Scaffold this active site. Structure first.
Site, PDB file in Angstrom:
ATOM      1  N   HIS A  94       4.295  -4.667   5.328  1.00 40.10           N
ATOM      2  CA  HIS A  94       3.227  -3.810   4.833  1.00 40.10           C
ATOM      3  C   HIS A  94       2.749  -4.294   3.472  1.00 40.10           C
ATOM      4  O   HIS A  94       3.537  -4.779   2.655  1.00 40.10           O
ATOM      5  CB  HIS A  94       3.691  -2.355   4.743  1.00 40.10           C
ATOM      6  CG  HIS A  94       2.568  -1.379   4.557  1.00 40.10           C
ATOM      7  ND1 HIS A  94       1.994  -1.128   3.329  1.00 40.10           N
ATOM      8  CD2 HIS A  94       1.905  -0.602   5.446  1.00 40.10           C
ATOM      9  CE1 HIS A  94       1.030  -0.236   3.469  1.00 40.10           C
ATOM     10  NE2 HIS A  94       0.955   0.100   4.744  1.00 40.10           N
ATOM     11  N   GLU A 166      -4.544  -4.742   7.633  1.00 42.08           N
ATOM     12  CA  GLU A 166      -4.799  -3.917   6.463  1.00 42.08           C
ATOM     13  C   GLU A 166      -5.986  -4.487   5.705  1.00 42.08           C
ATOM     14  O   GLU A 166      -5.885  -5.597   5.163  1.00 42.08           O
ATOM     15  CB  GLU A 166      -3.572  -3.866   5.555  1.00 42.08           C
ATOM     16  CG  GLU A 166      -2.262  -3.542   6.246  1.00 42.08           C
ATOM     17  CD  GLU A 166      -1.183  -3.151   5.256  1.00 42.08           C
ATOM     18  OE1 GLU A 166      -1.393  -2.171   4.510  1.00 42.08           O
ATOM     19  OE2 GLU A 166      -0.138  -3.833   5.205  1.00 42.08           O
TER      20      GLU A 166
END
Ligand SMILES: [Cl-]
EC number: 5.3.1.1
Lengths: 249, 248
Positions: A94, A166
């Site tokens: 992430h 993302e």
């Protein structure tokens, strides 16, 4: 022809026992009729609570991070410990871990490969910054991040792999990401996977959008052909997450 | 000598079967002296230990935490720990100082935020073999402690526990004597004596974080400035009971 949708709730580091119990009850009473794999990803200390309360059959539980091996790693949770407690999904790479906690491509790719070897389903995150997007490097970065992961996997291991794009360039920057700009990166990634790994692997691979998703733009986002679901942030801590799941039909 | 502490630093180890079995062994071990026993499992194992470990002499600590909840994937905040009922925390461990970017100032801020939120903190310091061989034992541990101290008031020191790790003895082939441990504990308490206050230094718990087992815990606790142990591999074994009894 699209693969199975995924709707992942990325709670991040948020939640109280009352918060989670109230939210999980909302998730459970939400009847879902189409084929979709739903994912709750709570903090480590809340996994037992979610395990005790989450009952909707569409859902599994994912860890927000993991290390490959148990041992002298104070503060960390290992993948074998996660298998022992019954958790089979994990989010790796992430942007917040690559940014705040210094996770590199070598670390992230090693976590994905070891998770795939230990039977995990993996949601591996890639994304580029604004400065990188300004330099015409979107492909350069997201393919360098995807090649590093692929370099430690074989063909069969890709049935456990899920990608989450993302738009870091549209995070806390005051800049916005359109459903067309997302579809562009999502197809950019699938063609690399088609060319470098295999055609059957690309068509079945799930590519999730990890940007701003709410009840208003979820369906239009899922309307694009190379978007396979979402990695939802703020809206996932709300009953609004039900509508986001509805929009994956 | 103030109240000793016996902390079980499980690190990233354990299964539900092994923890439930060991917790029962701890549960069947009656402790009848003034000591604070601590078990610090992985985040995933905190609810299991809170439910099962029933010795009134024990509390449960986290191995790590961050100050505030929010968009920090993979991390566990301090408010989340308080909501679930965790009031203790290990901060600045050598493994996190080494492999997870916890500088002296990052440890100092974490300790300060933890005390502000009502946490009991076990703050970890220690020097490497390179440092010790450069005659830097005092320089490193006092610089680690002075950074923590600059973020704390006098009253916050009643919630802080220092844990000296002889990092120069971990995986190096070197081993630490009790006399070498007492030497570091002494100068630690002496700096607190002369920069925080003679009152805080007397009541400060300074735990030894080296190799501790049943064979040496008594000899180690016999040293005047050692106030307990932060136990590693022995803490996952039933011989943690003998280490507790050695703090009598
Ligand atoms: Cl809502």
């Amino acid at each position: 022809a699209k693969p199975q949708p995924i709707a992942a709730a990325a709670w991040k580091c948020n939640g109280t026992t009352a918060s989670i119990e109230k939210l999980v009850q909302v998730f459970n009473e939400h009847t879902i009729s189409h084929d979709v794999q739903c994912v709750v990803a709570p903090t480590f200390v809340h996994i037992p609570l979610v395990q005790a309360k989450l009952r909707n059959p569409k859902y599994v539980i994912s860890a927000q991070n993991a290390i490959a091996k148990s041992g002298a790693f104070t503060g960390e949770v290992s993948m074998p410990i996660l298998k022992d407690i019954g958790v089979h999904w994990v989010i790796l790479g992430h942007s917040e871990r690559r940014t705040y906690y210094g996770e590199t491509d070598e670390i992230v790719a090693q976590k994905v490969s070891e998770a795939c070897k230990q039977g995990f389903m993996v949601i591996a995150c890639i994304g580029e910054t604004l400065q990188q997007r300004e330099a015409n490097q979107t492909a350069k970065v997201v393919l360098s991040q995807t090649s590093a992961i692929a370099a430690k996997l074989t063909k069969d291991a890709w049935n456990q792999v899920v990608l989450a794009y993302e738009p870091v360039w549209a995070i806390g920057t005051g800049k916005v990401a359109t459903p067309e700009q997302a579809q562009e990166v999502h197809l950019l990634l699938r063609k690399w996977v088609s060319e470098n790994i295999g055609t059957d692997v690309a068509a079945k691979l799930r590519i999730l959008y990890g940007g701003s998703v709410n009840a208003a733009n979820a369906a239009t986002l899922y309307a694009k052909p190379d978007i396979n679901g979402f990695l939802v942030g703020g809206a996932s801590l709300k009953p609004e997450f039900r509508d986001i799941i509805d929009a994956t039909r």
